[PDB]
């Protein structure tokens, strides 16, 4: 798609609007009062670059925003901070997770945004500016950021739940319903997990640096807030390695239960084999073409001395 | 459930009682002599909060209290220190373990405790006030805290004896009783450990902050005592990471137990097969429609050269 | 094969030529305008040596440039810098990759380049110096070096893509086309990943030092540049480890698949073994040769045959 | 069990004796000449207490003494040094290793020793005193400590050797005598290493600590020696870690053996199965009720051409 | 055996000699001109003590000279430095490696050297003194120490090349020549690796600590070469670790090869049975004693509808 979404606001009031013309939003640069410019759809290179040239942001940053498959990171410029955030979808049952790159610039009184597509995790931060919630009005553009980063960070929690279900609904199938496609899912989880912690790890660094560095973030006013988040991020980081670990032995768990049935199937063939092997034989030999019930008795006799010998095993 | 349970005391005497009226205890904030306030059950949020207000507690600390799914932690504020802890109960046999969150706060001369549910490990501290044991009465709130939390440290230990025991039993089945349920209980263990590891490592970090920082805690007076506790902490970690190291390898032990029983059954079947396969054959060619013991005379001959050839094996 | 190759340029004009005469390039040591000396074929050590002696390069380095089993490293000197890269060629199907050692020294207004064999990645750089593009003409010796280095980095993505395929394919043979030769590949894969990440880890460290360190570098202005490829570098030293971690546990997934299959092979062998062993038997003991309703047998054989069938509806 | 063992000694003469009375060995605190007062059997708290006071040793230490599940640690007070240490014994055969805690306090002119039971590694130390060997007579209680120390650590090498062999031996069984028990002993080994490493790892730090700190221990005189015990402490550790590494994969090594044998019992059956399965058929089909050697020849042709097949595998 | 080989060189001239008398090489302590003394054969504990005291060396050192099972290390003193080093020798084909302890003390104009036996890698160094190659003649005692340390390190490369060959040749066996004794050599490799790894990691720390200290190591003249050897040290470490990683897997790689093969002996088996089981049955059922081709064709029909069915698999 394409769109652009600004949310200027102040302690007293706010205004909001949705345009598709880039020149209607550029004068907010010089707002005294905080703004949030959301640019859905980065695919329009010309929109980005325009915004990118007007604000005074280096080309390589602008090019960064158009490169999609990245680490999450921060970089501190003279008048602006630059951040690179991911934000996941997980379809359940078709066990597959998606990741949309967001990019963010903190200058003057504006929090720039760059979303690949429509549909996003900041529909709570939106409401808090519209209906005068929390301390979101009272404060500045760097708090706005902390609003935006938080809203995203919280999202993971609920993804972290969703998989926590997937694990639980796999260390069952493993040890009770041993099956072909169970193996698939298992690796499918193990993989996705990797992709997760490949993002969350730098994500803690991002927040770890933001907290502990500070330039045009108003210091002893927004930094604990950021720290609160930084705490949130540690938790999760932890919580991935956690699952990672549990999922790893998991495949050997299947293995062990798989083999254990092979065994059972073996015995079955062995005892049925082991008894009707010799009984067919004596039946076969008295087919030699060259007292009747007494052979049947020592058939029965020797048949059941196998039967009480597999009680001593099997 | 729900209760309150104070135990005031000084060098000389002591008092203690119980209620379900928050307003009776509040006055104990202005005690010149120590006080242990035990608000068990934290579902009754108005009580928590009533207090949370009266004593000067900031609402985020108070929310913390309410959320029981937390990183065990410690926050220092101006007139008070704040701590969270976990508390475990392992059901033997079901192989299942449960987590209460214990919240705490030191302030001036008072120890605000917050439990989810009746039932705790603080009895042995209760008695040391009750019958005047040790040097509890001659020392202050911080000490009470130490005490209280040392009383916790000590709990994990039995929990580490109990689990050990579960290791012992499991490392019998694995090698001697190859079975389905054994697989289950093993992983079950793995899981539990993780959760323990997860709790203890941070828990550790807590005592480390306390020890080497100390703000309203009679400094060169208690710090050591916290050191001693800070140590047990460590100990437990070791023990923990020990067991981790052990269990992990366990499954691979059992895996090997069973692939070693497959090899048996294969010899049962193989040799059975291997002697009645050619003997039921050659008395098959004499059941065609086109000396007699000379037949049996070579049927024994080979019958035996087989059982000699598996003495070179088996 | 051997080949010297120089490209001299500045804002206005440029020149280029391919030589097999070493002395027809040395005088570029005293160029006011940038110069990119590419010496393909480091077997002709005498050539290398001469470039050295002339420029005033310390033997150690010189020798290192010949020594092609080496860790990618930066060493900074008085007037020059020294850098050593590796450049990779993955062959697909035969899952087998080869790495060239390229070596670089910036100095005055020269970027000395020593390859091992004709054949590289840099071509698009040569386009940008030839057909006046980007901002490479405007910038000097150093920017170039970045451009050169960037060039290579970029190639690694390419390989990563190709590699990335080599996994997706291989996790359909793992759990659907189980076989011998799948195994082989899996090792080859892992080995190669090993050799690879082995080269990146320091590689990162090369671009890292360069940025936060700096000696004779058109720093202000280009530091950011050195930094932007150093970004890419971490990116890929991560994305490597992603594969290590995935592929590591790959031989276990396969395990789980294979036994599951064997198990099936047992099932069929048994539910046959178990039903036609006895029915062969009772149809065996009626081949006795002593003196003593025939469809009753076929019936009671029908009956007890079917209870076997229905009993493997409680398993199998 | 309970005793006390005094070993006063100077350059000129020495005296020693044994006793079940705590008061006899007190006056020595005031010895101008170094002494070694050994306390065996600290199941007598009452006595451990008594001196605890007398020598002016802070009760926390006295507790840490009487609690025998602890980390090797080092703590330097004003008038004293204090050190906890373990002392391992391997029962060969009953793969199982026991520990006894020895705590130590250097003060004035007396090394204090605290053991759980009679039976220690210190013997050698005594001799050198008894019969004036080395320089130990010429030097003070600090040295006495170092020696008592060096003694014990060295005893770990002895302990290594014993472990080395267990290994040598087990890495035969595995690849030469595949069996149910062999496993057991593997595991056992792996347990005994971990508990070892466990004590060694800290211990190392107990020797690292001493060396780089030095308060009362006549310094550039005794430092170099203590370092030597230290150097050894490191050597020990490394060694331990080598084995862990070796022994981890051992069972993998073992699995690869058993599973490999299965391979052969399968083939075995297969060929006997495969060559007779169709030969008992084709005979079996001529016992129908409705060129005799031509078939046997075919059977001789078609028993021959399975063979040729297996000269391309097996 | 036993030998002493001293070399006393100066920018103008040199002299060298072999003598098994330990009094003739003692004047060289007081040489203005650099000296390199090589003791070969450290079984003679009379000559390490004689030369150990003459130079003034501490015993603890002269004992560690002797202790040839040691972690390579560097220790510094007043008038001399100490360095314990190993040198490896690998038996190809027998897949076995044996070491030797070379100990080294830099003092005045004398590098004392302590070799267990004759046979060593310093033949090239002796070349660069004898014929006046390079710049060792013009340089002093510490350049020698370097030139020495370097030859030894360059040693490990020719070693690493041998091992590479082994891995290569082994990893041909795992995946194509599966067997019993293959799996042994694996383990062999691992051990040796792990012996190698254990030695190298500190040798690194040696040239790490030689390089960033320098007292009677002529500073900005030779510390640019200690660096160079230090570099090759890192390389070797790196390269070595390479292997640990590769090999650790290999074992697993073998097991997948075997456990595939069992399957291909399963298929074989099942199918012959599959077909010659129901067919061996009906022949039986017309071997009962109470339109002929008709069955022969329906045998044809069913025997081959199996055939078909296994082209869907197999
Ligand atoms: Cs980029
Ligand atoms: Cs918050
Ligand atoms: Cs890709
Ligand atoms: Cs592709
Ligand atoms: Cs204790
Ligand atoms: Cs036991
Ligand atoms: Cs050996
Ligand atoms: Cs020593
Ligand atoms: Cs018949
Ligand atoms: Na594994």
UniProtKB/Swiss-Prot annotation, chain C:
Residues 153-200 form a coiled coil. Changing residue 288 to C/I/L/V: Abolishes pentamerization. Abolishes ion transport. Changing residue 270 to L: Strongly reduces Co(2+) uptake. Abolishes Co(2+) uptake. Residues 1-267, 313-316 are cytoplasmic. The record marks 269 as: Important for closing the ion permeation pathway in the closed state. GO terms for cellular component: plasma membrane. It is found in: Cell inner membrane. Changing residue 290 to W: No effect on pentamerization. Increases ion transport. Changing residue 263 to L: Abolishes Co(2+) uptake. It is a multi-pass membrane protein. The record marks 263 as: Essential for ion permeation. GO terms for biological process: cobalt ion transport; magnesium ion transmembrane transport; protein homooligomerization. Changing residue 274 to L: Reduces Co(2+) uptake. Abolishes Co(2+) uptake. Changing residue 280 to L: Abolishes Co(2+) uptake. One of its GO terms (molecular function) is cobalt ion binding. InterPro entries: CorA_cytoplasmic_dom, CorA_TM1_TM2, Mg/Co-transport_prot_CorA, MgTranspt_CorA/ZnTranspt_ZntB. A motif (Probable selectivity filter) lies at residues 287-289. The central ion permeation pathway is formed by the first transmembrane domain from each of the five subunits. Mg(2+) binding strengthens interactions between subunits and leads to the formation of a symmetrical homopentamer surrounding a closed ion permeation pathway. Co(2+) binding also induces a conformation change. Low Mg(2+) concentrations trigger both a conformation change within each subunit and a loosening of the interactions between subunits. This results in an open ion conduction pathway. In addition, this results in a less symmetrical shape of the whole complex. Mediates influx of magnesium ions. Mediates Co(2+) uptake. Has high selectivity for Co(2+). Alternates between open and closed states. Activated by low cytoplasmic Mg(2+) levels. Inactive when cytoplasmic Mg(2+) levels are high. NCBIfam families: corA. This is Cobalt/magnesium transport protein CorA.
